[PDB]
């Protein structure tokens, strides 16, 4: 997250760190949202690589023991069947991970609230992106979980020529684009939390930014629209 602030430890308890085994250690690669005690929602592109993955819930600082973490292996990966790694702009950037164990809920570990199917946010709706992704274009990962305020940019504007054009689809949410604040590499798969009727819900799964840079004016961060996939999510959980 470029232009973020450090999140309070208990603000976004559904945020997870998705990590892969690297030598004798583990490396953060993407975010995710805990949606059941044994299911995480993340981006399909986060799990294209043939890596060993684990999920960390209750994580705050990737570089120190927080005394709150639970570490769990990934038992099964279900990528949306229309996902094409060759074509992120086509959409379908979503995957569900079944965890090897059910995690225990507390102030630091909670299920993410999902929107009702089909829900679209009014232009300029208040949202926060969260994650440990790069804090600058071509920078480095955050140590502590970051948040940034990214108001939505509706489809009519986001798909306009000076924004994302045909690249953005109605199955996506755009947010930000102020040139200062944005997602960045390492935030993919994590939540966009948006305030609707007094409650934050996870309306986006972080998917892509411009190849030119993370915080680029009129290139808002683009998210898979969670409310386009409610039936898909329910069907996966029911069949697995």
């Amino acid at each position: 997250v470029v232009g973020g602030t450090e999140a309070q430890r208990n603000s976004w308890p559904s945020q997870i760190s998705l990590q892969y085994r690297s030598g004798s250690s583990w490396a953060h690669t993407c975010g995710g949202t805990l949606i059941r005690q044994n299911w995480v929602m993340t981006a399909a592109h986060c799990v294209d690589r043939e890596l060993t993955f684990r999920v960390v819930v209750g994580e705050h600082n990737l570089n120190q023991n927080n005394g709150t973490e639970q570490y769990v292996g990934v038992q099964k990966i279900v990528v949306h069947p229309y996902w094409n790694t060759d074509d992120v702009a086509a959409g379908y950037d979503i995957a569900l991970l079944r965890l090897a164990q059910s995690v225990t809920l507390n102030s630091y570990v909670q299920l993410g609230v999902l929107p009702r199917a089909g829900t679209i946010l009014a232009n300029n709706s208040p949202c926060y992106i969260t994650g440990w992704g790069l804090t600058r274009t071509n920078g480095q990962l955050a140590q502590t979980l970051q948040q940034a305020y990214l108001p939505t940019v509706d489809y009519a504007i986001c798909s306009s020529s000076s924004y994302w054009g045909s690249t953005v689809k109605n199955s996506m949410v755009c947010a930000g684009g102020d040139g200062v604040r944005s997602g960045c590499q390492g935030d993919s798969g994590g939540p966009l939390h948006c305030l609707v009727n007094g409650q934050y819900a996870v309306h986006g799964v972080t998917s892509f930014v411009s190849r030119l840079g993370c915080n680029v004016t009129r290139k808002p961060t683009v998210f898979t629209r969670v409310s386009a996939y409610i039936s898909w999510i329910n069907n996966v959980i029911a069949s697995n």
Binding site: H28, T29, C30, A43, H45, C46, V88, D93, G133, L141, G183, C184, Q185, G186, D187, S188, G189, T206, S207, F208, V209, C214, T221
Partner: peptide, 4 residues
């Protein structure tokens, strides 16, 4: 994609 951002991703990492």
């Amino acid at each position: 994609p951002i991703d990492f």
